[PDB]
């Protein structure tokens, strides 16, 4: 169940002189990468990055590649224009990033479409939520915005983001249903680490879970301790699942009073754990 997403993350980086720009596109369905294209392959092509994508035949891969190659060209041109907008010399490397895709509800209604850009690590221009106005981030992007308004391009994007994006997302979820339509609950436990003669650290672990969204919180009898925790960012295990931990320093003698609570799509009921070996 639940919402899903199809997203591409696209990066072009110039290389001063007579390398053409590196162009890289990666696709994800929810938290699972499924394709890539890299210009630095010696024969570059859209390629599957998940086994279930091998179900697509030669025409899919060819059509995807032609599209990537066309967009590669787009960035070669747009990198040159930006450099002129910002009066940058040819000595320097610069970076365009683009993301686009669709979020859909459980019912398959589009929830949100995206099409946006960053230049040299900051927002450049973004298609708004309405899928027809643009937010520009600086005076250079304003020039782009007026051009894309005159041209009516938002109509084209809107058409893709409604319709096509969603249709292809539905198809991927079907082709990949054994891995994409599956939830893996966190395997959770608490570890005990001596700190001082008065204190110890309790670390609550959440391991092997999918999808990546998760809440880990420590309490003391329904008193939230979230702002007293040490946390790490959710991290990939490398096998398609994720990891997280949250830790608290507690007095010797009182460890059992503290509870770690785990919320996750895979849990109908949140988990409550303690240091109780």
């Amino acid at each position: 169940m639940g919402p899903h997403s199809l997203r591409y993350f696209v990066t072009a980086v110039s290389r001063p002189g007579l390398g053409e720009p590196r162009f890289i596109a990666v696709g994800y369905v929810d938290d699972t990468q499924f394709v890539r294209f890299d210009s630095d392959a010696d024969n570059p092509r859209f390629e599957p990055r998940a086994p279930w994508m091998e179900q697509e035949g030669p025409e899919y891969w060819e059509e995807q590649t032609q599209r990537a190659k066309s967009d590669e060209q787009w960035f070669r041109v747009s990198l040159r224009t930006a450099q002129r907008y910002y009066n940058q010399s040819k000595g320097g490397s610069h970076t365009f990033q683009r993301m686009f895709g669709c979020d859909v509800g459980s019912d398959w209604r589009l929830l949100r479409g995206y099409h946006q850009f960053a230049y040299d690590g900051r927002d450049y221009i973004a298609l708004n939520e309405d899928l027809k106005t643009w937010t520009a981030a600086d005076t250079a992007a304003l020039i782009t915005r007026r051009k894309w308004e005159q041209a009516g391009d938002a109509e084209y994007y809107r058409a893709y983001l409604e319709g096509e994006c969603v249709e292809w997302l539905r198809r991927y979820l079907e082709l990949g249903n054994e891995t994409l339509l599956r939830t893996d609950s966190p395997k959770a436990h608490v570890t005990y680490h001596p700190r001082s003669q008065v204190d110890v650290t309790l670390r609550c672990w959440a391991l092997g879970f999918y999808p990546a969204d998760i809440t880990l919180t420590w309490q003391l009898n329904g008193e939230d301790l979230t702002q007293d925790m040490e946390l790490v960012e959710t991290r990939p295990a490398g096998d398609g699942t994720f990891q997280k931990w949250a830790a608290v320093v507690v007095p010797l003698g009182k460890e059992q009073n503290y509870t770690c609570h785990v919320h996750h799509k895979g849990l109908p009921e949140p988990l409550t754990l303690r240091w109780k070996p």
Partner: peptide, 9 residues
């Protein structure tokens, strides 16, 4: 399929 951009920047 992959969306090809329209007008350039």
């Amino acid at each position: 399929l992959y969306l090809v951009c329209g007008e350039r920047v």
